[PDB]
Amino acid sequence: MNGTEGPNFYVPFSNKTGVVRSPFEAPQYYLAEPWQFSMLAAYMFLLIMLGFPINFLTLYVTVQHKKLRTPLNYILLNLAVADLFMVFGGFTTTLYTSLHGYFVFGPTGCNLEGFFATLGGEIALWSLVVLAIERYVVVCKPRFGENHAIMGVAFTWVMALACAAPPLVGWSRYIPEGMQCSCGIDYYTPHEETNNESFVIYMFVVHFIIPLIVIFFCYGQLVFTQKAEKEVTRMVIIMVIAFLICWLPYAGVAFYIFTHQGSDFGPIFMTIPAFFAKTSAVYNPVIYIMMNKQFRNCMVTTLC
Template sequence: MSNFRFEEKHAIAGLAFSWVMALTCAAPPLFGWSRYIPEGMQCSCGIDYYTPKPEINNTSFVIYMFVLHFCIPLFIIFFCYSRLLCTVRAAAAQQQESETTQRAEKEVTRMVIVMVISFLVCWVPYATVAWYIFANQGTEFGPVFMTAPAFFAKSAALYNPVIYILLNRQFRNCMITTVCCGKNPFGDDEATTAVSRTQTSSVSSSQVAPA
Protein backbone atom coordinates (compact mmCIF):
# COMPACT_ATOMS: atom_id res chain seq x y z
CA MET A 1 0.00 0.00 0.00
CA SER A 2 2.96 2.35 0.55
CA ASN A 3 3.59 2.42 -3.23
CA PHE A 4 -0.05 2.83 -4.22
CA ARG A 5 -0.74 5.29 -7.04
CA PHE A 6 -4.22 6.53 -7.80
CA GLU A 7 -4.67 6.09 -11.56
CA GLU A 8 -7.37 6.61 -14.15
CA LYS A 9 -8.63 3.04 -13.78
CA HIS A 10 -9.22 3.64 -10.08
CA ALA A 11 -11.20 6.80 -10.86
CA ILE A 12 -13.31 4.90 -13.41
CA ALA A 13 -13.95 2.10 -10.92
CA GLY A 14 -14.95 4.65 -8.29
CA LEU A 15 -17.38 6.35 -10.67
CA ALA A 16 -18.88 3.01 -11.69
CA PHE A 17 -19.33 2.01 -8.04
CA SER A 18 -20.98 5.37 -7.29
CA TRP A 19 -23.51 4.85 -10.09
CA VAL A 20 -24.23 1.30 -8.94
CA MET A 21 -24.88 2.53 -5.41
CA ALA A 22 -27.09 5.32 -6.75
CA LEU A 23 -29.12 2.75 -8.69
CA THR A 24 -29.51 0.51 -5.65
CA CYS A 25 -30.88 3.56 -3.86
CA ALA A 26 -33.17 5.01 -6.54
CA ALA A 27 -34.33 2.01 -8.59
CA PRO A 28 -36.12 -0.30 -6.08
CA PRO A 29 -39.26 1.88 -5.75
CA LEU A 30 -39.60 1.78 -9.54
CA PHE A 31 -39.88 -2.01 -9.34
CA GLY A 32 -42.32 -2.30 -6.43
CA TRP A 33 -40.12 -2.17 -3.34
CA SER A 34 -41.54 0.91 -1.58
CA ARG A 35 -42.67 3.89 -3.68
CA TYR A 36 -42.10 7.56 -4.40
CA ILE A 37 -44.63 10.14 -3.20
CA PRO A 38 -44.75 13.97 -3.20
CA GLU A 39 -43.00 15.35 -0.12
CA GLY A 40 -42.75 18.66 1.67
CA MET A 41 -44.32 21.43 -0.40
CA GLN A 42 -45.40 18.81 -2.96
CA CYS A 43 -42.95 20.14 -5.55
CA SER A 44 -40.63 17.11 -5.45
CA CYS A 45 -40.85 13.40 -4.77
CA GLY A 46 -39.16 11.30 -2.14
CA ILE A 47 -39.28 7.91 -0.48
CA ASP A 48 -42.51 7.09 1.34
CA TYR A 49 -41.52 7.34 5.00
CA TYR A 50 -45.08 8.14 6.03
CA THR A 51 -46.97 4.85 5.65
CA PRO A 52 -46.08 1.21 6.50
CA LYS A 53 -47.58 -0.19 3.25
CA PRO A 54 -46.88 -3.90 3.90
CA GLU A 55 -47.95 -4.80 0.35
CA ILE A 56 -44.84 -3.04 -1.01
CA ASN A 57 -42.55 -3.91 1.93
CA ASN A 58 -42.13 -0.25 2.76
CA THR A 59 -40.76 -0.81 6.27
CA SER A 60 -37.91 -3.03 5.11
CA PHE A 61 -36.96 -0.53 2.39
CA VAL A 62 -36.77 2.39 4.81
CA ILE A 63 -34.52 0.37 7.12
CA TYR A 64 -32.42 -0.70 4.12
CA MET A 65 -32.03 2.92 3.01
CA PHE A 66 -31.15 4.17 6.46
CA VAL A 67 -28.50 1.50 7.07
CA LEU A 68 -26.93 1.01 3.63
CA HIS A 69 -27.19 4.53 2.25
CA PHE A 70 -26.69 6.64 5.38
CA CYS A 71 -25.13 4.85 8.35
CA ILE A 72 -22.55 2.86 6.38
CA PRO A 73 -21.47 5.80 4.14
CA LEU A 74 -21.19 7.98 7.25
CA PHE A 75 -18.92 5.41 8.90
CA ILE A 76 -16.82 5.06 5.72
CA ILE A 77 -16.42 8.83 5.42
CA PHE A 78 -15.19 9.22 8.99
CA PHE A 79 -12.90 6.19 8.71
CA CYS A 80 -11.33 7.11 5.35
CA TYR A 81 -10.90 10.79 6.07
CA SER A 82 -9.37 10.10 9.48
CA ARG A 83 -6.89 7.71 7.84
CA LEU A 84 -6.17 10.32 5.18
CA LEU A 85 -5.45 12.98 7.79
CA CYS A 86 -3.18 10.62 9.72
CA THR A 87 -1.21 9.80 6.55
CA VAL A 88 -0.90 13.44 5.51
CA ARG A 89 0.20 14.49 8.99
CA ALA A 90 2.79 11.70 9.04
CA ALA A 91 4.16 12.90 5.69
CA ALA A 92 4.27 16.48 6.95
CA ALA A 93 6.08 15.37 10.12
CA GLN A 94 8.74 13.61 8.05
CA GLN A 95 9.27 16.71 5.91
CA GLN A 96 9.05 19.49 8.47
CA GLU A 97 11.62 21.54 6.57
CA SER A 98 9.38 21.61 3.48
CA GLU A 99 7.09 24.62 3.48
CA THR A 100 5.17 23.18 0.54
CA THR A 101 4.40 19.98 2.42
CA GLN A 102 3.29 21.86 5.52
CA ARG A 103 1.02 24.09 3.44
CA ALA A 104 -0.42 21.06 1.64
CA GLU A 105 -1.12 19.36 4.98
CA LYS A 106 -3.05 22.38 6.24
CA GLU A 107 -4.95 22.63 2.96
CA VAL A 108 -5.97 18.96 3.00
CA THR A 109 -6.99 19.14 6.66
CA ARG A 110 -9.14 22.21 6.05
CA MET A 111 -10.76 20.66 2.99
CA VAL A 112 -11.55 17.38 4.78
CA ILE A 113 -13.16 19.19 7.71
CA VAL A 114 -15.31 21.30 5.38
CA MET A 115 -16.37 18.26 3.33
CA VAL A 116 -17.37 16.25 6.39
CA ILE A 117 -19.34 19.17 7.81
CA SER A 118 -21.09 19.71 4.46
CA PHE A 119 -22.10 16.03 4.33
CA LEU A 120 -23.50 16.22 7.86
CA VAL A 121 -25.39 19.44 7.09
CA CYS A 122 -26.87 17.90 3.95
CA TRP A 123 -27.91 14.49 5.20
CA VAL A 124 -28.23 14.39 8.99
CA PRO A 125 -31.35 16.65 9.06
CA TYR A 126 -32.99 14.65 6.25
CA ALA A 127 -32.16 11.26 7.79
CA THR A 128 -33.24 12.40 11.25
CA VAL A 129 -36.57 13.84 10.11
CA ALA A 130 -37.25 10.88 7.81
CA TRP A 131 -36.61 8.39 10.61
CA TYR A 132 -38.74 10.43 13.02
CA ILE A 133 -41.62 10.43 10.53
CA PHE A 134 -41.14 6.70 9.94
CA ALA A 135 -41.16 5.99 13.69
CA ASN A 136 -44.28 8.13 14.22
CA GLN A 137 -46.42 7.06 11.28
CA GLY A 138 -49.95 8.37 11.38
CA THR A 139 -48.95 11.65 13.01
CA GLU A 140 -49.71 14.78 11.01
CA PHE A 141 -46.76 16.88 9.84
CA GLY A 142 -46.72 20.29 8.23
CA PRO A 143 -45.24 20.66 4.72
CA VAL A 144 -42.30 22.74 5.93
CA PHE A 145 -41.27 19.96 8.33
CA MET A 146 -39.86 17.88 5.46
CA THR A 147 -39.24 20.63 2.90
CA ALA A 148 -36.17 22.17 4.57
CA PRO A 149 -34.33 18.86 5.14
CA ALA A 150 -35.19 17.74 1.60
CA PHE A 151 -33.75 20.98 0.22
CA PHE A 152 -30.44 20.40 2.00
CA ALA A 153 -30.31 16.77 0.86
CA LYS A 154 -31.02 17.57 -2.78
CA SER A 155 -28.36 20.29 -2.80
CA ALA A 156 -25.69 17.82 -1.67
CA ALA A 157 -24.45 17.23 -5.22
CA LEU A 158 -23.47 20.91 -5.47
CA TYR A 159 -21.18 21.18 -2.46
CA ASN A 160 -18.25 18.87 -3.23
CA PRO A 161 -17.25 20.50 -6.56
CA VAL A 162 -17.53 23.96 -4.98
CA ILE A 163 -15.40 22.89 -2.01
CA TYR A 164 -12.75 21.38 -4.27
CA ILE A 165 -12.62 24.46 -6.51
CA LEU A 166 -12.40 26.90 -3.60
CA LEU A 167 -9.99 24.98 -1.36
CA ASN A 168 -7.81 22.88 -3.69
CA ARG A 169 -5.44 24.74 -6.01
CA GLN A 170 -4.61 21.71 -8.14
CA PHE A 171 -8.28 20.93 -8.75
CA ARG A 172 -9.00 24.60 -9.41
CA ASN A 173 -6.16 24.82 -11.94
CA CYS A 174 -7.38 21.71 -13.79
CA MET A 175 -10.92 23.08 -13.87
CA ILE A 176 -9.79 26.47 -15.23
CA THR A 177 -7.54 24.82 -17.82
CA THR A 178 -10.36 22.52 -18.97
CA VAL A 179 -12.94 25.31 -19.22
CA CYS A 180 -10.47 27.60 -21.04
CA CYS A 181 -9.53 24.98 -23.66
CA GLY A 182 -6.15 24.03 -22.23
CA LYS A 183 -4.95 27.49 -21.18
CA ASN A 184 -4.93 29.18 -17.79
CA PRO A 185 -5.63 32.91 -18.31
CA PHE A 186 -4.70 33.63 -14.69
CA GLY A 187 -1.02 32.78 -15.20
CA ASP A 188 1.26 29.91 -14.30
CA ASP A 189 1.23 30.25 -10.51
CA GLU A 190 -1.64 27.80 -10.14
CA ALA A 191 -0.01 25.31 -12.51
CA THR A 192 3.34 25.56 -10.73
CA THR A 193 1.66 24.97 -7.40
CA ALA A 194 -0.25 22.00 -8.84
CA VAL A 195 2.91 20.35 -10.17
CA SER A 196 4.72 20.95 -6.89
CA ARG A 197 1.78 19.55 -4.96
CA THR A 198 1.66 16.46 -7.17
CA GLN A 199 5.38 15.83 -6.71
CA THR A 200 5.04 16.24 -2.95
CA SER A 201 2.11 13.82 -2.92
CA SER A 202 4.10 11.24 -4.87
CA VAL A 203 7.08 11.46 -2.50
CA SER A 204 4.82 11.28 0.55
CA SER A 205 2.85 8.27 -0.68
CA SER A 206 6.04 6.34 -1.41
CA GLN A 207 7.63 7.10 1.95
CA VAL A 208 4.74 6.90 4.39
CA ALA A 209 3.13 3.58 5.21
CA PRO A 210 -0.49 3.51 6.39
CA ALA A 211 -0.98 3.81 10.12
Protein backbone atom coordinates in the same frame (compact mmCIF):
# COMPACT_ATOMS: atom_id res chain seq x y z
CA MET B 1 -54.27 9.79 11.84
CA ASN B 2 -53.55 13.49 11.49
CA GLY B 3 -52.91 13.48 7.72
CA THR B 4 -54.68 12.03 4.68
CA GLU B 5 -53.64 8.79 2.98
CA GLY B 6 -54.57 8.08 -0.62
CA PRO B 7 -53.64 5.31 -3.06
CA ASN B 8 -50.23 6.78 -3.91
CA PHE B 9 -49.81 9.81 -1.62
CA TYR B 10 -49.83 10.95 2.01
CA VAL B 11 -50.81 14.57 2.61
CA PRO B 12 -49.72 16.04 5.99
CA PHE B 13 -53.08 17.80 6.37
CA SER B 14 -56.35 16.63 7.92
CA ASN B 15 -59.34 16.10 5.62
CA LYS B 16 -61.82 16.71 8.45
CA THR B 17 -63.04 19.75 6.47
CA GLY B 18 -63.09 18.04 3.06
CA VAL B 19 -60.56 20.24 1.25
CA VAL B 20 -57.71 17.76 0.66
CA ARG B 21 -57.12 17.00 -3.02
CA SER B 22 -54.65 14.61 -4.61
CA PRO B 23 -51.25 16.19 -5.42
CA PHE B 24 -51.51 14.51 -8.83
CA GLU B 25 -54.85 16.17 -9.64
CA ALA B 26 -55.07 19.77 -8.40
CA PRO B 27 -53.01 22.63 -6.93
CA GLN B 28 -52.29 22.30 -3.21
CA TYR B 29 -53.42 25.82 -2.29
CA TYR B 30 -55.49 24.50 0.63
CA LEU B 31 -52.30 23.84 2.66
CA ALA B 32 -50.15 26.86 1.71
CA GLU B 33 -50.44 30.24 0.05
CA PRO B 34 -49.44 30.74 -3.60
CA TRP B 35 -46.56 33.05 -2.64
CA GLN B 36 -45.08 30.14 -0.67
CA PHE B 37 -45.09 27.94 -3.79
CA SER B 38 -43.56 30.78 -5.83
CA MET B 39 -40.62 30.86 -3.40
CA LEU B 40 -39.98 27.17 -4.11
CA ALA B 41 -40.09 27.77 -7.87
CA ALA B 42 -37.80 30.81 -7.65
CA TYR B 43 -35.31 28.85 -5.53
CA MET B 44 -35.39 25.99 -8.05
CA PHE B 45 -34.82 28.36 -10.98
CA LEU B 46 -31.72 29.70 -9.24
CA LEU B 47 -30.26 26.23 -8.66
CA ILE B 48 -30.85 25.24 -12.29
CA MET B 49 -29.21 28.39 -13.66
CA LEU B 50 -26.17 28.03 -11.37
CA GLY B 51 -25.96 24.24 -11.33
CA PHE B 52 -25.72 23.74 -15.09
CA PRO B 53 -22.81 26.16 -15.77
CA ILE B 54 -20.65 25.37 -12.74
CA ASN B 55 -20.92 21.62 -13.35
CA PHE B 56 -20.48 21.81 -17.13
CA LEU B 57 -17.38 23.97 -16.58
CA THR B 58 -15.95 21.48 -14.09
CA LEU B 59 -16.52 18.68 -16.60
CA TYR B 60 -15.03 20.71 -19.46
CA VAL B 61 -11.88 21.81 -17.62
CA THR B 62 -11.15 18.29 -16.36
CA VAL B 63 -11.33 16.72 -19.83
CA GLN B 64 -9.32 19.55 -21.42
CA HIS B 65 -6.35 19.28 -19.02
CA LYS B 66 -4.69 15.84 -19.05
CA LYS B 67 -2.73 16.68 -15.88
CA LEU B 68 -5.96 16.38 -13.84
CA ARG B 69 -6.02 12.61 -13.37
CA THR B 70 -5.52 12.13 -9.63
CA PRO B 71 -8.13 10.14 -7.68
CA LEU B 72 -9.53 13.47 -6.50
CA ASN B 73 -9.82 14.74 -10.09
CA TYR B 74 -11.71 11.61 -11.17
CA ILE B 75 -14.17 11.72 -8.27
CA LEU B 76 -14.92 15.42 -8.76
CA LEU B 77 -15.48 14.83 -12.48
CA ASN B 78 -17.87 12.01 -11.55
CA LEU B 79 -19.75 14.33 -9.17
CA ALA B 80 -20.03 16.98 -11.91
CA VAL B 81 -21.61 14.40 -14.25
CA ALA B 82 -24.05 13.19 -11.58
CA ASP B 83 -24.86 16.82 -10.72
CA LEU B 84 -25.85 17.44 -14.35
CA PHE B 85 -28.22 14.47 -14.22
CA MET B 86 -29.81 15.99 -11.10
CA VAL B 87 -30.30 19.37 -12.79
CA PHE B 88 -31.76 18.24 -16.12
CA GLY B 89 -33.25 14.89 -15.16
CA GLY B 90 -34.72 15.97 -11.85
CA PHE B 91 -34.71 19.72 -11.24
CA THR B 92 -36.64 20.52 -14.43
CA THR B 93 -39.62 18.61 -12.99
CA THR B 94 -39.32 20.30 -9.58
CA LEU B 95 -39.48 23.75 -11.18
CA TYR B 96 -42.49 22.90 -13.35
CA THR B 97 -44.28 21.28 -10.39
CA SER B 98 -43.57 24.31 -8.19
CA LEU B 99 -44.95 26.75 -10.79
CA HIS B 100 -48.36 25.05 -10.89
CA GLY B 101 -48.52 23.84 -7.28
CA TYR B 102 -48.79 20.08 -7.94
CA PHE B 103 -47.33 17.22 -9.97
CA VAL B 104 -49.01 18.02 -13.28
CA PHE B 105 -47.05 15.17 -14.87
CA GLY B 106 -48.36 12.86 -12.13
CA PRO B 107 -46.63 9.80 -10.69
CA THR B 108 -44.18 9.69 -13.62
CA GLY B 109 -43.06 13.21 -12.76
CA CYS B 110 -42.69 12.23 -9.11
CA ASN B 111 -40.52 9.26 -10.13
CA LEU B 112 -38.27 11.56 -12.16
CA GLU B 113 -37.91 14.10 -9.34
CA GLY B 114 -37.14 11.49 -6.67
CA PHE B 115 -34.96 9.06 -8.65
CA PHE B 116 -32.37 11.56 -9.85
CA ALA B 117 -32.05 13.22 -6.43
CA THR B 118 -31.69 9.86 -4.68
CA LEU B 119 -29.23 8.68 -7.33
CA GLY B 120 -27.11 11.83 -7.19
CA GLY B 121 -27.07 11.97 -3.39
CA GLU B 122 -25.90 8.38 -3.02
CA ILE B 123 -23.17 8.83 -5.65
CA ALA B 124 -21.84 11.65 -3.46
CA LEU B 125 -22.00 9.53 -0.30
CA TRP B 126 -20.23 6.52 -1.76
CA SER B 127 -17.70 8.84 -3.42
CA LEU B 128 -16.76 10.10 0.06
CA VAL B 129 -16.27 6.45 1.04
CA VAL B 130 -13.89 6.06 -1.92
CA LEU B 131 -11.94 9.20 -0.97
CA ALA B 132 -11.72 8.19 2.69
CA ILE B 133 -10.15 4.85 1.74
CA GLU B 134 -7.83 6.65 -0.69
CA ARG B 135 -6.68 9.11 1.99
CA TYR B 136 -6.18 6.30 4.51
CA VAL B 137 -4.04 4.28 2.09
CA VAL B 138 -2.04 7.31 0.91
CA VAL B 139 -1.34 8.89 4.31
CA CYS B 140 -1.17 5.88 6.65
CA LYS B 141 0.42 3.58 4.02
CA PRO B 142 -1.06 0.38 5.54
CA ARG B 143 -0.55 2.42 -3.89
CA PHE B 144 -3.98 3.84 -4.72
CA GLY B 145 -3.56 4.71 -8.39
CA GLU B 146 -5.59 5.56 -11.47
CA ASN B 147 -7.17 2.10 -11.78
CA HIS B 148 -8.46 2.12 -8.19
CA ALA B 149 -9.96 5.60 -8.63
CA ILE B 150 -11.80 4.59 -11.80
CA MET B 151 -12.90 1.31 -10.21
CA GLY B 152 -14.22 3.44 -7.37
CA VAL B 153 -16.17 5.58 -9.83
CA ALA B 154 -18.04 2.58 -11.25
CA PHE B 155 -18.52 1.34 -7.69
CA THR B 156 -20.43 4.51 -6.74
CA TRP B 157 -22.98 4.06 -9.56
CA VAL B 158 -23.58 0.40 -8.67
CA MET B 159 -24.30 1.20 -5.03
CA ALA B 160 -26.35 4.32 -5.82
CA LEU B 161 -28.51 2.43 -8.34
CA ALA B 162 -28.95 -0.33 -5.74
CA CYS B 163 -30.67 2.34 -3.60
CA ALA B 164 -32.45 4.58 -6.15
CA ALA B 165 -33.81 1.90 -8.54
CA PRO B 166 -35.97 -0.55 -6.47
CA PRO B 167 -38.55 2.17 -5.63
CA LEU B 168 -39.13 2.39 -9.39
CA VAL B 169 -39.94 -1.33 -9.69
CA GLY B 170 -41.89 -2.38 -6.61
CA TRP B 171 -39.72 -2.16 -3.46
CA SER B 172 -40.89 0.95 -1.60
CA ARG B 173 -42.01 3.86 -3.80
CA TYR B 174 -41.39 7.54 -4.41
CA ILE B 175 -44.05 9.76 -2.88
CA PRO B 176 -44.56 13.55 -2.62
CA GLU B 177 -43.47 15.24 0.62
CA GLY B 178 -44.06 18.48 2.50
CA MET B 179 -45.99 20.99 0.37
CA GLN B 180 -46.12 18.05 -2.15
CA CYS B 181 -43.84 19.67 -4.77
CA SER B 182 -40.91 17.25 -4.31
CA CYS B 183 -40.63 13.48 -3.94
CA GLY B 184 -38.75 11.05 -1.71
CA ILE B 185 -38.92 7.58 -0.15
CA ASP B 186 -42.22 6.57 1.48
CA TYR B 187 -41.59 6.95 5.22
CA TYR B 188 -45.27 7.62 5.83
CA THR B 189 -47.40 4.53 5.09
CA PRO B 190 -47.01 0.77 5.63
CA HIS B 191 -48.28 -0.15 2.13
CA GLU B 192 -47.49 -3.87 2.43
CA GLU B 193 -47.83 -4.42 -1.34
CA THR B 194 -44.45 -2.69 -1.75
CA ASN B 195 -42.85 -3.93 1.51
CA ASN B 196 -42.09 -0.37 2.57
CA GLU B 197 -40.73 -1.16 6.03
CA SER B 198 -37.91 -3.45 4.91
CA PHE B 199 -36.64 -0.94 2.33
CA VAL B 200 -36.33 1.94 4.83
CA ILE B 201 -34.33 -0.29 7.18
CA TYR B 202 -32.20 -1.41 4.23
CA MET B 203 -31.68 2.18 3.02
CA PHE B 204 -30.60 3.51 6.42
CA VAL B 205 -28.31 0.59 7.26
CA VAL B 206 -26.54 -0.14 3.96
CA HIS B 207 -26.74 3.35 2.43
CA PHE B 208 -26.34 5.58 5.50
CA ILE B 209 -24.71 3.91 8.51
CA ILE B 210 -22.25 1.51 6.86
CA PRO B 211 -20.73 4.31 4.69
CA LEU B 212 -20.40 6.61 7.72
CA ILE B 213 -18.71 3.86 9.76
CA VAL B 214 -16.13 3.44 6.97
CA ILE B 215 -15.45 7.17 6.64
CA PHE B 216 -14.93 7.75 10.35
CA PHE B 217 -12.81 4.61 10.65
CA CYS B 218 -10.41 5.94 8.01
CA TYR B 219 -10.48 9.39 9.62
CA GLY B 220 -9.81 7.91 13.05
CA GLN B 221 -6.77 6.12 11.67
CA LEU B 222 -5.65 9.44 10.15
CA VAL B 223 -5.87 11.36 13.43
CA PHE B 224 -4.24 8.79 15.74
CA THR B 225 -1.27 8.04 13.46
CA GLN B 226 3.44 16.24 1.79
CA LYS B 227 2.17 19.78 1.36
CA ALA B 228 0.42 18.62 -1.82
CA GLU B 229 -1.07 15.66 0.04
CA LYS B 230 -2.14 17.90 2.94
CA GLU B 231 -4.11 20.14 0.57
CA VAL B 232 -6.13 17.12 -0.62
CA THR B 233 -6.80 15.75 2.86
CA ARG B 234 -7.99 19.21 3.89
CA MET B 235 -10.51 19.35 1.03
CA VAL B 236 -11.90 15.88 1.77
CA ILE B 237 -12.50 16.90 5.39
CA ILE B 238 -14.60 19.88 4.25
CA MET B 239 -16.42 17.71 1.70
CA VAL B 240 -17.55 15.37 4.47
CA ILE B 241 -18.57 18.26 6.75
CA ALA B 242 -20.55 19.89 3.94
CA PHE B 243 -22.30 16.57 3.24
CA LEU B 244 -23.33 16.25 6.90
CA ILE B 245 -24.66 19.83 6.97
CA CYS B 246 -26.65 19.18 3.79
CA TRP B 247 -28.20 15.79 4.56
CA LEU B 248 -28.40 15.33 8.35
CA PRO B 249 -31.50 17.55 8.82
CA TYR B 250 -33.34 15.59 6.12
CA ALA B 251 -32.15 12.24 7.51
CA GLY B 252 -33.33 13.09 11.03
CA VAL B 253 -36.80 14.26 10.01
CA ALA B 254 -37.30 11.26 7.71
CA PHE B 255 -36.33 8.85 10.48
CA TYR B 256 -38.56 10.68 12.97
CA ILE B 257 -41.55 10.36 10.62
CA PHE B 258 -40.84 6.67 9.99
CA THR B 259 -40.94 5.96 13.74
CA HIS B 260 -43.99 8.23 14.30
CA GLN B 261 -46.27 7.46 11.36
CA GLY B 262 -49.57 9.31 11.52
CA SER B 263 -48.36 11.84 14.10
CA ASP B 264 -49.23 15.54 14.06
CA PHE B 265 -46.94 17.40 11.65
CA GLY B 266 -47.62 19.90 8.89
CA PRO B 267 -46.37 20.50 5.34
CA ILE B 268 -43.55 22.84 6.36
CA PHE B 269 -42.03 20.14 8.59
CA MET B 270 -40.44 18.28 5.67
CA THR B 271 -40.54 21.06 3.04
CA ILE B 272 -37.55 23.04 4.38
CA PRO B 273 -35.17 20.06 4.93
CA ALA B 274 -36.17 18.62 1.55
CA PHE B 275 -35.41 21.75 -0.47
CA PHE B 276 -32.29 22.60 1.56
CA ALA B 277 -30.91 19.19 0.53
CA LYS B 278 -31.25 20.07 -3.16
CA THR B 279 -28.20 22.35 -2.84
CA SER B 280 -26.25 19.08 -3.13
CA ALA B 281 -26.16 19.54 -6.92
CA VAL B 282 -24.09 22.76 -6.65
CA TYR B 283 -21.76 22.98 -3.67
CA ASN B 284 -19.06 20.38 -4.45
CA PRO B 285 -17.46 22.28 -7.39
CA VAL B 286 -17.50 25.44 -5.21
CA ILE B 287 -15.35 23.67 -2.61
CA TYR B 288 -13.19 22.33 -5.45
CA ILE B 289 -12.42 25.84 -6.74
CA MET B 290 -11.73 27.20 -3.24
CA MET B 291 -9.54 24.33 -1.99
CA ASN B 292 -7.53 22.93 -4.94
CA LYS B 293 -4.98 25.36 -6.38
CA GLN B 294 -4.08 23.30 -9.46
CA PHE B 295 -7.70 22.92 -10.56
CA ARG B 296 -8.46 26.59 -9.83
CA ASN B 297 -5.55 27.66 -12.03
CA CYS B 298 -6.67 25.32 -14.82
CA MET B 299 -10.14 26.89 -14.76
CA VAL B 300 -8.72 30.42 -14.99
CA THR B 301 -6.53 29.27 -17.89
CA THR B 302 -9.55 27.66 -19.58
CA LEU B 303 -11.91 30.57 -18.85
CA CYS B 304 -9.40 33.25 -19.91
